[PDB]
Symmetry: C3
Subunit: 95 residues, 3 copies
């Protein structure tokens, strides 16, 4: 059940697909910044990748609090669906 | 993203529209009183207020614990959708 | 009542594709971080499908598991969690 095992990265699904990547990244930064230091936020607007984002935290504890605190939060009328990434970002190996 | 910025008041939607007002308020009180001092609960089944409820806590910290703990709780067979109220 | 803390969480909206043995091993792997699990009840009878009970040694463990895993998207389905009721 790797998606339930804490690591530095949360995977968010069920995001409103009408939000532009630029606006999405700024909004996710304002939502998630209260849980710890964000290294970066990933959004692909490649057709298959819409409604999805990755928030990478400096510490695992920050990602866990963010995941438990924001699970199901109705953002632009849609509940956020949050997991941990199955694999954690290469940036963590470089920390 | 002001719906995600902590406030004294939580805004709940996706409430079961078949529950009547006196029973919905009493149930909302019984669920939310463990998180802090509740100043008041606004429910109306009138117009664009239906399926919704405002719980006003004495302290913001109580609202934050209430919203995070009860987000998606299946209340009368519907998952609670909880935001902070707008200022 | 479903909101009043007790030793046991009742989970539904579980994907019915999952078989008894894998579902119990998966639920133990998911919920073991919240406290000591005493057992997990699963039945693959029709009326018991998509459902499970996780019994913790302490009520505080059950409360943490329910608040922490509420709505968790497991096999494409957000977990629905309540405390066990009569």
């Amino acid at each position: 059940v790797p998606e339930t095992r804490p690591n530095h990265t949360i995977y968010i699904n069920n995001l409103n697909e009408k939000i532009k990547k630029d606006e999405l990244k700024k909004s996710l930064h304002a939502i998630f910044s209260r849980f710890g230091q964000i290294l970066d936020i990933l959004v692909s607007r490649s057709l298959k990748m819409r409604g999805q984002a990755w928030v990478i935290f400096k510490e695992v504890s920050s990602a866990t609090n963010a995941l438990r605190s924001m699970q199901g939060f109705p953002f632009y009328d849609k509940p956020m669906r949050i997991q941990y990434a199955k694999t954690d970002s290469d940036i963590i190996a470089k920390m």
